[PDB]
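Example record

Each entry pairs one chain with its bound ligand, 0SA.
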Amino acid sequence: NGSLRQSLRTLDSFSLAPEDVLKTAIKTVEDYEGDNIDSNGEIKITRDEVVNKVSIPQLYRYTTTLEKLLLFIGTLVAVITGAGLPLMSILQGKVSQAFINEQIVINNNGSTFLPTGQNYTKTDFEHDVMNVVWSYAAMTVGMWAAGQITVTCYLYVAEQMNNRLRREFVKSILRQEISWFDTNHSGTLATKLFDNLERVKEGTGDKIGMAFQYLSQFITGFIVAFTHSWQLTLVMLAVTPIQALCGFAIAKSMSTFAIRETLRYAKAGKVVEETISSIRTVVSLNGLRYELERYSTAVEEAKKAGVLKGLFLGISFGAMQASNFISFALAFYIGVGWVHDGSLNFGDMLTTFSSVMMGSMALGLAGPQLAVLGTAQGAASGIYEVLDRKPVIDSSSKAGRKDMKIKGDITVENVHFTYPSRPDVPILRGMNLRVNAGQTVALVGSSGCGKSTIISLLLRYYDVLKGKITIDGVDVRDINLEFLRKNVAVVSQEPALFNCTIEENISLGKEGITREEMVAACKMANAEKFIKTLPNGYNTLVGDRGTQLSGGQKQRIAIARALVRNPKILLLDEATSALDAESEGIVQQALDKAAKGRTTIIIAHRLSTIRNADLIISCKNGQVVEVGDHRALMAQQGLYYDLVTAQTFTDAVDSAAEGERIGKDALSRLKQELEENNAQKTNLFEILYHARPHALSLFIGMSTATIGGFIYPTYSVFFTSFMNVFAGNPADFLSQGHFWALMFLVLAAAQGICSFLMTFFMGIASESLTRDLRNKLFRNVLSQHIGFFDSPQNASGKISTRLATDVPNLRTAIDFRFSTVITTLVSMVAGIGLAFFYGWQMALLIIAILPIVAFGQYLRGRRFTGKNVKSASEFADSGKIAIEAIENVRTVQALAREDTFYENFCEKLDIPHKEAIKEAFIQGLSYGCASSVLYLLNTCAYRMGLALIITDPPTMQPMRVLRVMYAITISTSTLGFATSYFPEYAKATFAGGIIFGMLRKISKIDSLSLAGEKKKLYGKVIFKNVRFAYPERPEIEILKGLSFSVEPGQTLALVGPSGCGKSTVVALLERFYDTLGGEIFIDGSEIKTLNPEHTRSQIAIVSQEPTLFDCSIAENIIYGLDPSSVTMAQVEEAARLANIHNFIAELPEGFETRVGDRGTQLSGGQKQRIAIARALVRNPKILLLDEATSALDTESEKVVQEALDRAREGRTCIVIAHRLNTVMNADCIAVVSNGTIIEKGTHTQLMSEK
Ligand SMILES: *[C@H]1O[C@H](CO)[C@@H](O[C@@H]2O[C@H](CO)[C@@H](O[C@@H]3O[C@H](CO)[C@@H](O)[C@H](O[C@H]4O[C@H](CO)[C@@H](O)[C@H](O)[C@@H]4O)[C@@H]3O)[C@H](O)[C@H]2NC(C)=O)[C@H](O)[C@H]1NC(C)=O
Ligand SMILES: CCCCCCCCCCCS[C@@H]1O[C@H](CO)[C@@H](O[C@H]2O[C@H](CO)[C@@H](O)[C@H](O)[C@H]2O)[C@H](O)[C@H]1O
Ligand SMILES: CCCCCCCCCCCS[C@@H]1O[C@H](CO)[C@@H](O[C@H]2O[C@H](CO)[C@@H](O)[C@H](O)[C@H]2O)[C@H](O)[C@H]1O
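C-alpha cells for the complex follow.
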C-alpha cells in the first residue's frame, strides 16, 4: 500500500498545474498519518495480495464475443475522450490569437495587421471565433457521448464478466476433493476468496477506461505540444526535475518526522498506560504529580518535533509552489525571445504551453488507475487456481455406475491409508473387516487406530492408498460418487445444520420430500416432541439469525435428515460424544431405532451402548485385532475385554463419588466513542476557542493565508497582461514581455513565503493545542476518584489511545489543511469580484454556468445520490450462502446437495446483478455529463465574448474579455480539492466532542487537591456505622453498618467469608471511595475533611500481588518521595528490615537492576518484600495489610511473614486475611460476616467462645 502511494506521489509531482502542487502536497502528509502509519511511525507495506499474477487476457476470459467487442469499442472511445484537453489547447491558441489580433485592430483605429499586412475585417474575426465556438460545441455533445460510451461499456462488461466468474467459482469449489480443503484448512479461506472476488471487479471496471483516457492525454498532450513548439516543451520539461525534488522533499521530511514524532510520544504513551492500569497503586504511593511531570516532559518533546515538522513542510511545500511559477516565468522569458525573432507564433506558444500541462497532469492520474488493474491480476490467482483450472482427482460430478440395487454388503480388504497432509504418519495399515447385509457392526478401539477414517473412506472423501473397499462386491472407486453418497448416510459427531428452517434442513435429505415423509423420520429420530413445544414449529429458522437449539436437539434433526432418504447403509460416528450426560439418553434411543432395518457401522466412545451389536470389531494401530460378538470377545480377554472392564471401572468410581474480536478505522470508532458518553460533538469555533492561548500564531497563519489567497487572482492579471503585450506593439514585445515574465519570479517568491508562513505558524497553533489538551486531560484523569476507572469507557487502553490519536485527530481541523480552505475561499471571492470589475456582462454569464460546471466535477468524484451502502449490501447475502457451503463442504458433499447450494447462491445473486447493469447505464450517463461540462463553459464564454466585441460602440474590448475569463477559471482552480477538508473536519468534530466533554467532568473525590485539613496522623482509626456500596453496583450493599476502633500502635485483624465486606476496609480508608452512610474518623477528623494528598502519604499498603514499575529497585522503593528527601543509606536500612538486603546487594549492580522488565524476574516472595521496603522508607503512621501473604502457607510464607511483623511495630495496622492462621499476634481480631462484625477480642479470648 505504502510503496505504491509513494511512487504514485512522484507521478503527481511532475504535474505543472499550480493547483496540483497544492493537491500533491496535502496528499503527501496524509500518506504519513493515522491508519497509514504503524506503531513505530513507519509506512504500512505489503500487509493489509498474491505472489503470482494472472495474465490480463486471461483475466478478461468469460467475456462473450459481443462483450469483447463492447470492450474494444469502449477502449477506442476512451482514447478520444483523453484527446479532448489537448485538442482544446489548439482551440485555445487559435481563439487567443484571434482575440489578441482584433485588439491590434482596435488599437490602430481599424486597419490591417503588422505580420504580412492582413486586413483583419470584422468578418475575419467573426469567422475565427465562431469556428472555435462551434468546435467547443461539437466537443460538448461529442465528449458526452464519448464519456458515456467509455464508462457504460466498461462497467457493463465488468459486471457481466464478474457475475459469471462468481457463480463459476462457487460451482467449482464445492466440487473439489476434501483433501484440498485439508491443505487450505483455514476457516477464513471462504471469506478471503470472496474478498478477492470483489477486488477483481474493482480493477476490470471503468477504472480501465479511465486508465486509457489518462494514457492518451499524456501522449496526445505532448504530441500537440511538440508539433507546435519542440523548443518550449524541452524548455519546460527541463524545470520539472527541480519541482520533483521539492516533491521528494515533502515525502522525505514527512516520513522522517513521522518516525521521530511517534518514537518521542511512545515514551509518553508508556507513562499514561502503566499508571492508569495501576492507578490504585500510584495513588497509594503518592506519585501522581511525579507522573504528571514525566508525561508533560514527554509531550513537550513531541510538540517540539511537531513544530519542526511544520518548518520542513513549510520550506518544501513553499519551494514546490515557488519553483512551479519559475517554470512559467522561464518559459515566458524565452517565449517573447522567440516571437520577436519571428521564430514562434503567439497562438502556437499559448498552445504548446497549455499542452504540456495537460500532458504532465495526465501522468499523475494514469498511475492510480493502472495500479487497480495490478491488484486485480493478483487477487484473481487464488480464485483461478480453483476455478476449473485444476482438474480434481475426486470429481463429485462424473459417472461410475448407477445400475446396482444395494443390499448393504461392505468389505474392507488390506486397506493401507495415510492422509495427504501429514503423509508421514500412517493411520490404517492392512485392515481387514467384513460387514454383511443387515448387520449392525461396531468399531471399537483406542484413539490411535482409525475407526473413524473407515467412514471417511466409505464416503470416498479420500482414496484408499493400498487395498480396496467394496459395497455389494463392487469397488467404491468404480461406483458413481453421487450415487454412493445418496445410498450411504452419515451422522457425524458434531451435527451441521444450515441457516434455514428445521424442515428445510431435513428436506435436504431427499429430492422429492413429502410432509408426511418428513414427520415419519422426525418421530423416529425422537425430534417431533420438542419441535412442537417451540414456536413456529418446523417453520422456525435454526442458525445465526434464528434460535440456538441444544446440541442434543441439533443432532436429532441430523439423525432425521439421514433417515429421510431411507439408506441401505448408515454410518454413526460418535454422534453422542459431544453431548452432556442428561442429553445423551434420548439421542441414543434415536440412534438405535435408526440402525434397525439396515447395515450400520457404529463408532462409539461409550462401550455400554455397543454391547448388543451384531458384531464387534476391535482396532489397534490401524488394523483389526479381534472380531466377534460381546460374549465371544469377553471370553478371549482381548483388547475389547480390556476396554470394557477398564471403562466400566472408571464409570463405577465416578458414579459412586458423584451420583482481537473487533477492528476498524478511526471514523467509525469515534462515532461509537461519542456514544457511551454524553459527548455532544464539537464545532470549529469551539475548537478555536480552546486554541485561544495560541491566537497569535493562529492569526499570522490565517492572515498570511488570506494574503496568500490573493495570489491566484493576481496570477490571472500577470498572465493576461503578458498576452496584452502581443496585442499591438512596435517591437515592444521585449520591453514589456521580459517584464511580465520576470514578474512571475516575484509572484513565485510571494507564494513561496506566504505558503511557508502559513503551514509553519498554523503548525505551531495546532501542535501547541495538542500539547495543551494533553496535559489538561491527563491532569483531569489522575485527579479522578478511582470509581472513575471502574467504568468501562475509562479503561487503561481507551484513555491511552484518546491522548495518542484522538487529540492529534482534533489537530487536523486547525493545521494547514484548514488554512488552505481560507486561501481557496478568498481567491474564489476576490477572483469573481475582479472578474466583475473588468466586465460585468462577461462575468455574470460565466458565473451562471459555474453551478453546472461544479455539478459535473461533483459527478466526476463517482458519488451519485448520497451513498452506496444499500447497493452492495445485497451482495453480502449471496456471499453468506456461499461461505456457509464452503464452511460445511463435507456435509453438502455427503448429502449430494452441492448442486442445490449453487442454485441458491445464483438466485440470491440475480437481484444484485440485475440492478448493477441498470446502474452501469446510470453511472455512464453521469460521466457523460461530467466530462463534457467543461467544454460547455468555453462554447458559451467565447460566444458571449464575441457578441460583446462585434457590437457597434463596442461594449467590451477583446483583451478585456479574456481578463474576465481567466479571473474566474484561474481563481477557482483550487476549489475542487478544497472539499477534502470536510471529511477530516467531521472526524475531528467527534474527537473534540469527546475530549472537551471529558474535561468538563470533575472529580467527586479530587486527588491532587491542595484543600482540606493537612494534619499529622497518630493512628486513631475509627469506623462508625459505616455503610458502603460500590459505584458500579449501587443497589447491592457490601458494608451493612461496620463499626470498630483501632488505637495507635494497635493491630486489628478482619477475618471472614468472601464478599462479606472486609476487603473494602483498605479501600475506604485510603479514600478510593466515599461512604454511603456513617463516618470514618482518623485521629478525630472525619476522612472527608482531610486533604487526600497529605494523608495518603502517611498511609502505606502491601497487597497480595504488589505491582512494581519499569525502573530500578532503588527508585521503585522510594517511588513517591522526591530525590532530595531520602538518603541511599535509608533505602538499604529499609531493605534490611524487609529481608531483601541479601538478594539485591549480593546481586549484580545492586539496587540499580531493572525490575518489572517484561514481567517480574524476582519471585512473588521477593516482590512482596520490596513492597515492605517501600513502606519503610516513608515511616507510615498507619499501615494497611491486605492479604499480605500470597505464598500459599508454605516455605516462602514464613520468610516474608516474619518480615511483616518487624514493620508494624511502632505504627497502627489493619490486617485483612483470607487465611485464619497468620491472624495471631494481633492486638485485637474481629469477624465480619455480612458487613458487620459479630465477635471481637484477641486470639486467645476469641478462641474460648465457640
Ligand atoms: C482592407 O480594409 C478595407 C476593406 O473593406 C478597405 O478600406 C477602404 O478604405 C477606403 C479609404 O478610406 C474607402 O474609401 C473609398 O472607397 C471607394 C470605393 O471603393 C474608392 O473609390 C476610393 O478610392 C479612391 O478613389 C479615387 C481614385 O483616385 C481617389 O480620388 C480617392 O481619394 C480614393 O483614394 C476610396 O478607397 C473604401 O470604402 C474601402 N475599400 C473599399 C473597396 O470599399 C482597405 O482598402 C483594404 N485594404 C487593402 C490594402 O486592400
Ligand atoms: C449536490 C451538488 C453539489 C454541487 C456543488 C459542487 C461544489 C464544488 C465541487 C465539490 C465536489 S468535487 C470533488 O472533487 C474531487 C476531485 O475531483 C473528488 O475527489 C476525487 O477525485 C480526486 C482527484 O482530485 C481524488 O484525489 C479523490 O481520491 C477522489 O475521491 C471529490 O469526490 C469531489 O467531491
Ligand atoms: C455566485 C458565486 C458562484 C460560485 C460558483 C463556484 C463554482 C466553482 C466550480 C469549480 C469546479 S472544480 C474545477 O474544475 C475545473 C475544470 O472544470 C478544474 O480546472 C483545471 O482542470 C481542467 C481540466 O479538467 C483544466 O482545463 C483547467 O485549466 C484547470 O485549471 C479545476 O482544477 C477544478 O477546481
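DSSP finds 45 helices and 24 strands in the chain.
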